[PDB]
Design a protein around this nucleic acid. Structure first.
Ligand code: CL
Ligand code: CL
Ligand code: K
Ligand code: MG
Ligand code: MG
Ligand code: MG
Ligand code: MG
Ligand code: MG
Ligand code: MG
Ligand code: MG
Ligand code: MG
Ligand code: MG
Ligand code: MG
Ligand code: MG
Ligand code: MG
Ligand code: MG
Ligand code: MG
Ligand code: MG
Ligand code: MG
Ligand code: MG
Ligand code: MG
Ligand code: MG
Ligand code: MG
Ligand code: MG
Ligand code: MG
Ligand code: MG
Ligand code: MG
Ligand code: MG
Ligand code: MG
Ligand code: MG
Ligand code: MG
Ligand code: MG
Ligand code: MG
Ligand code: NA
Ligand code: NA
Ligand code: NA
Ligand code: NA
Ligand code: NA
Ligand code: NA
Ligand code: NA
Ligand code: NA
Ligand code: NA
Ligand code: NA
Ligand code: NA
Ligand code: NA
Ligand code: NA
Ligand code: NA
Ligand code: NA
Ligand code: NA
Ligand code: NA
Ligand code: NA
Ligand code: NA
Ligand code: NA
Ligand code: NA
Ligand code: NA
Ligand code: NA
Lengths: 337, 132, 53
RNA sequence: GUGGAAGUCUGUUAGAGUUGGUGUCCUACAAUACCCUCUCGUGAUCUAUGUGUAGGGGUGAAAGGCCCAUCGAGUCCGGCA
RNA sequence: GCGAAAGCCAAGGCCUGUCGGGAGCAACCAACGUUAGGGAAUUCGGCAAGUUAGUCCCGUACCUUCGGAAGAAGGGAUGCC
RNA sequence: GGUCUUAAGGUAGCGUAGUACCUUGCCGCAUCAGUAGCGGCUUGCAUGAAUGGAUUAACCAGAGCUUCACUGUCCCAACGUUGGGCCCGGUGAACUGUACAUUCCAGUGCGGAGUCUGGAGACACCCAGGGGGAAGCGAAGACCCUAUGGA
RNA sequence: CGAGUGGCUUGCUACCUCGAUGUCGGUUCCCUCCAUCCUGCCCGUGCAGAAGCGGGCAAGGGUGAGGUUGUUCGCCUAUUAAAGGAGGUCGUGAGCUGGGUUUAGACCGUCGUGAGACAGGUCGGCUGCUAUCUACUGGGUGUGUAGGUGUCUGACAAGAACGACCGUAUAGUACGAGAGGAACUACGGUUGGUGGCCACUGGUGUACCGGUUGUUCGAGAGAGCACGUGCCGGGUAGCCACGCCACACGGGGUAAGAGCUGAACGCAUCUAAGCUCGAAACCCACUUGGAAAAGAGACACCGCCGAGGUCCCGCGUACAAGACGCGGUCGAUAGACUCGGGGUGUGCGCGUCGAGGUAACGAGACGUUAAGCCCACGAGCACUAACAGACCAA
């Protein structure tokens, strides 16, 4: 009677098209719980190695024992919150009100922007506070950019600009917290936002693969047995029934596969350090040598080596934070062999 | 069931002919079903080390031959992973005939056994000469 | 640990342990060693191997 | 031991045949093709050339097979508008 | 080498089985190689593919019209100096 | 039934058959499970003696079934190789075409509509794809009936 | 006995098509229905418990593997939470298959004088087409909104992004004479689905290195061919799955249901007004897309004779064209070289040994030699090449 079977692939990550921005954009943010702070950071994927860890889980029978864990190494140097954007609550949703900038700009920010020559910070600040007084102040986020120049393995110098939100105690306090960060020079580090052991949400634009067939793109079957030898091997049975007389968008077809934005949830931050403790012998294949500020993320992260990846405090973690895990060993063995 | 404490790539399928690691009188076993398992369309039901499979007696004494008994997978050629990363694999695929209480039917267990099997089937464990 | 074949130090979180029929245990550091072993080659006869060196 | 019989065996020797792939082709390279597979291969064998049998007639180890891409009665023209 | 077999190479012939240039050259298609563990679960059906293989030595069942079955099966050997 | 139709009234054998409707007959072998296969039984819808019956070694690109071996047939797909495919120069057809035509959901209609009705959606053009629909293209249906048709 | 609903079966009819709407079964891939098999929440019980039985709401998800048979159907086995039924031209042949029905060949049985027949059986017996329109999956070029760069907003759109099971503690506890034997909650794992990634294991790897058979270049050295690697052994990068990582809860409103207050009807009453609760189902939450949302958006800065863009040049985190991203001497973008990191497995030559042989000769052994050869990665390094310069633009 033809056995049932779930459809091939998910309909939740579509359309399966090329991403608009190589730099990921979070469409959600963590809640305003603790003290005022920036709700995200970024870095550049380098590669993978394994780490030996002590079982941190109190509910595990193996608690306290050695444990080998896969880790993706990401070079996460300091970023710079160059401006403070305030949104106002309008009858059509949130809308950008104004921005408060600075004067101290990184030598190569103009490779992307039309850096401000004449700006009035105070006025914008005033407008933001007046709106706040009126009770129309939506949320507050900081314009941020990376320093690719700080990462040798990454060829680009043109900084990746992205807006990150600030979640704080009160609106009045996080506003101040924001303004302060910016005034200095907006310089901040992964330490400032995260701590080893916390779970982060890593967003990134996956490894591109160009056009691919249904079999790879949607996980449909290959023609089987005799059917496989008739002239059809990797094409689905049919595009749909006689009626409705049209091909439904839900049928697995050929197209752009890869180079899409993805936001992987609950990624444990095994360790945030600095130096060359993680670099592989002979260099990370197709990347290079890591000798600077870095983050060790448990498991896989979307994207190819050199790609920009964004961090965010897990918006829906399942486990309780188990701070600063014990790292008894980090493999430095060559990734060639 | 209770966690194996090891990741397993099932190396057997329904219809697979394996070795009966005991003195029951049954030499060769044929996998029929995998307890607690439900597959998916076209997928041939898979069994691995640490599973309680249903078996048919292919070879052995006329008495045991052609019977349908339950058993536990003790060894398998396809590797398995341990917490420390290392893979572990055996020289053959083998199971031990078992009763309703998960107690070995026979008296003696031939060949070595996986340590992970112990956490699940104690009576089978405390009947093994070697535990790797 | 050390590879029961060539003799080099097995990088932690790597390798395979072949359990023999009799119950013996052989820790390999790589497929290269496992495969040279399957060919019946003894580590002592192969120069590249530390055992031989 | 000699002898060397056979509608004898193996065999892409030459040569002949045409089982499966229901592959390739299917406005073809081709109005019957291509590739692999497969059968026979000293005999009721295969083959060239010459020669005989002509249409309700030939020819047919018989399939209504074949008689110049034409066959349960060839082809051409006529009867015929 | 058993060979008018394969494979390699002379002599002799040819680059005219007559459109080219470019993209590590994507999907998909035709031919095809290799795939861990499992091993016909596939399918109307092992279709397709694969396995086996040359030579010598040992050895060889039921059945039989005494010819055969039969290379039954099964076991061993095989290079170079 | 313990003869009658119409001459005789099925003998040897074979038998659920390439013949058995009932039928997946019953029993057994084999398998976890066998409308299969083999063996036995057999009242045979409707076997049977040159309309040849039975049996049978050898032979077979003949039909069915079992085992060992084998393996990408399958679990479940991957990577690779060669030729295409894609882009450029040159060469250069055909099929098809009442008209209009960006359609989708419903309805209606000779009861199976891109074109009617109501709504919904819809900026134009182009490249690649696998073929859902145009009851797609190709052939004055082989099936069926009809004709005071043909052979 | 009576009243109906459906349009799956069968029958009836002869409306539609005979200048053809390709068959049955299967497969593959997509959507749907609910009369619900499982799962969630409930009511009754001939509800002690456990296991059930019957009923209600409910279509989110799931509903699988095999033996005979062409079968659909059905019979059977073992697993399972359960292995539900049905619609989409009995969905699906410009997708596949072709076992069955139903051409031409042949046999058997039955019938017939016979040709020959069969709503009997059987063996064999072909699957055409380069897509014009439309449809959708993905990719571009233009115009509209009316100079540019960067950052956003969110009308709407998609999702199952999550479904289910087993185990431990609770507990040998509640309940029960006993046998037997729960739950709330908290944990650990499994399976199915999903998205991503390759440190690890595994496959590939006609890059690469070695061994070796035949033959050709006189031998040697070193090579060609043996189908697109002769074969065998090993195998880097990358790509992969058989490998590894991630995928809630909680709120809000409801259904069935359990109730509160409460009248019509002084009482009673969950309902009539009002209210408190309560489903895997709905909404939010989360993920993906999304200024062409014609109300065609917001902010910031730069610029209107100059901001910015295209072409050009060296390249890829990108890629079928187009698109996209980066670098361009104020430079490490690519190549060369040298290192590092890797793959093979110990080079040519020479020396000693070498069964033997008068000697010639000699397969092979050891040393020189972790050697020789090789690398799709990394680094150092401006040596070579990123030169010259063109165009557009308020
Ligand atoms: Cl198929
Ligand atoms: Cl099963
Ligand atoms: K018709
Ligand atoms: Mg075909
Ligand atoms: Mg590697
Ligand atoms: Mg290694
Ligand atoms: Mg199936
Ligand atoms: Mg002969
Ligand atoms: Mg022959
Ligand atoms: Mg003649
Ligand atoms: Mg005839
Ligand atoms: Mg395999
Ligand atoms: Mg089968
Ligand atoms: Mg099947
Ligand atoms: Mg074959
Ligand atoms: Mg019978
Ligand atoms: Mg007679
Ligand atoms: Mg209209
Ligand atoms: Mg007609
Ligand atoms: Mg007729
Ligand atoms: Mg007539
Ligand atoms: Mg049609
Ligand atoms: Mg209902
Ligand atoms: Mg649904
Ligand atoms: Mg149909
Ligand atoms: Mg269907
Ligand atoms: Mg169709
Ligand atoms: Mg067709
Ligand atoms: Mg076609
Ligand atoms: Mg047929
Ligand atoms: Mg048939
Ligand atoms: Mg037939
Ligand atoms: Mg070659
Ligand atoms: Na084919
Ligand atoms: Na074809
Ligand atoms: Na159709
Ligand atoms: Na004689
Ligand atoms: Na042929
Ligand atoms: Na005539
Ligand atoms: Na005439
Ligand atoms: Na030419
Ligand atoms: Na008779
Ligand atoms: Na013959
Ligand atoms: Na293959
Ligand atoms: Na179509
Ligand atoms: Na009705
Ligand atoms: Na009807
Ligand atoms: Na018609
Ligand atoms: Na069909
Ligand atoms: Na449901
Ligand atoms: Na069945
Ligand atoms: Na139809
Ligand atoms: Na069909
Ligand atoms: Na067809
Ligand atoms: Na709720
Ligand atoms: Na716009």
């Amino acid at each position: 009677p033809q056995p049932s079977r779930p459809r091939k692939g998910s309909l939740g990550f579509g359309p399966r098209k090329r991403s608009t921005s190589e730099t990921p954009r979070f469409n959600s943010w963590p809640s305003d719980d603790g003290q005022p702070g920036v709700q995200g950071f970024a870095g550049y994927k380098a590669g993978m190695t394994h780490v030996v860890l002590v079982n941190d889980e109190p509910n595990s029978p193996r608690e306290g024992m050695e444990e080998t864990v896969p880790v993706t190494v990401i070079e996460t140097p300091p970023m710079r919150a160059v401006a403070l954007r305030a949104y106002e609550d309008t009858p059509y949703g949130q809308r950008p009100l104004t921005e408060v900038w600075t004067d101290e700009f990184h030598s190569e920010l103009d490779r992307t922007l039309d850096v401000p020559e004449d700006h009035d910070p105070d006025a914008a600040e005033e407008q933001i506070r007046d709106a706040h007084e009126a009770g129309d102040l939506g949320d507050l986020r900081l314009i941020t950019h990376t320093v690719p120049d700080a990462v040798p393995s990454v060829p680009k110098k043109k900084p990746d600009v992205m807006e990150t939100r600030v979640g704080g105690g009160s609106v009045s306090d996080r506003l101040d917290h924001a303004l302060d960060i910016v005034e200095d020079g907006g310089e901040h580090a992964m330490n400032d936002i995260f701590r080893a052991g916390e779970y982060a949400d890593v967003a990134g634009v996956t490894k591109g693969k160009g056009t691919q067939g249904p079999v790879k793109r949607w996980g449909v079957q290959k023609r089987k047995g005799k059917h496989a030898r008739q002239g059809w091997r990797r094409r689905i049975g049919n595009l749909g029934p006689w009626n409705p007389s049209r091909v439904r968008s839900t049928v697995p077809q050929q197209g752009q596969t890869g180079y899409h934005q993805r936001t992987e949830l609950n990624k444990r931050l095994i360790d945030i350090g600095e130096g060359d403790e993680p670099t592989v012998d002979g260099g990370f294949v197709n990347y290079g040598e890591v000798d600077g500020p870095y983050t060790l993320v448990k498991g896989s992260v979307p994207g190819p080596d050199k790609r920009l990846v964004r961090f965010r405090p897990a918006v829906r973690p399942n486990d309780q934070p188990r701070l600063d895990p014990e790292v008894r060993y980090v493999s430095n063995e060559s990734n060639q062999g | 069931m209770e966690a194996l404490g090891a990741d397993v790539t099932q190396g057997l399928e329904k219809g697979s002919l394996i070795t009966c690691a005991d003195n029951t009188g049954a030499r060769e076993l044929k996998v029929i079903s995998v307890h607690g398992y439900s597959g998916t369309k076209n997928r041939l039901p898979k069994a691995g080390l640490g599973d309680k499979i249903t078996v048919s007696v292919t070879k052995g004494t006329p008495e045991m031959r052609r019977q349908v008994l339950e058993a536990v997978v003790v060894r398998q050629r396809k590797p398995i992973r341990r917490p420390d990363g290392t893979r572990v694999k055996f020289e053959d695929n083998a199971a031990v005939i078992v009763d309703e209480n998960e107690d070995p039917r026979g008296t003696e267990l031939k060949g070595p056994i996986a340590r992970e099997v112990a956490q699940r089937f104690g009576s089978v464990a405390s009947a093994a000469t070697m535990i790797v | 640990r050390e590879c029961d074949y060539c003799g080099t130090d097995i990088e932690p979180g790597t390798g395979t342990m072949f359990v023999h029929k009799d119950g013996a245990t052989t820790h390999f550091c790589s497929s290269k060693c496992e495969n040279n072993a399957d060919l019946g080659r003894e580590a002592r006869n192969l120069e590249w191997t530390d055992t031989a060196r």
